[PDB]
Amino acid sequence: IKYRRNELFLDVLESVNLLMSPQGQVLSAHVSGRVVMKSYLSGMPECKFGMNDSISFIPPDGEFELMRYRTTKDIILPFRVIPLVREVGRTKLEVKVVIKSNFKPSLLAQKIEVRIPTPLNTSGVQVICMKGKAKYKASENAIVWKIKRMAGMKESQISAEIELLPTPPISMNFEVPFAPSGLKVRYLKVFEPKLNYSDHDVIKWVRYIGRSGIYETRC
């Protein structure tokens, strides 16, 4: 147990879940998270973690999920989906959804995907989107609309047309650079009283990764 380059990497992983109403009510929401700390420290130091709303320990040199929280109040909803459905005869279905990014322009949400579900009397789907790239997968049955990367606070609409046939909510997905829970690693004091390497002598690394689990929005 002895390294020359002393580092450690804090992983704050999340999964923000949402449940909205066609109008705009947050019928349900919460986030589940665990913090993994990948370290390589010399000796057997007793640490001091920090954060918002601080567990002390002696890290199992290697990799170990420190704690694991699960907030439910005052949550950050990374995206804001808002659709518009217009009926006609029984021939066509007018549908326009719009996603919104609610975060610091200095951050890029990636791996975005909206799934606007169609009905079973579907004959053909037409769609246009100045941004992104979508298609109507008849098997899964929906208009998978994928987006490479999207900045924050910006807007983006996708207008489709479901050609009905004579005779569910829009799910979303996304990875982010920040933690929706609001959490934040304040400090991680590395202390091995035996050996000569200090705390402000270590290289600390921390990353925030928010995944979207159940981000459905009633149509």
């Binding site: 890029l108 990875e175 982010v176 400090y187 402000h200 600390k204 690394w205 921390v206 990353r207």
Partner: peptide, 10 residues
Amino acid sequence: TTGVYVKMPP
């Protein structure tokens, strides 16, 4: 950036 780490501000 999504997996890129970042130095903490002690």
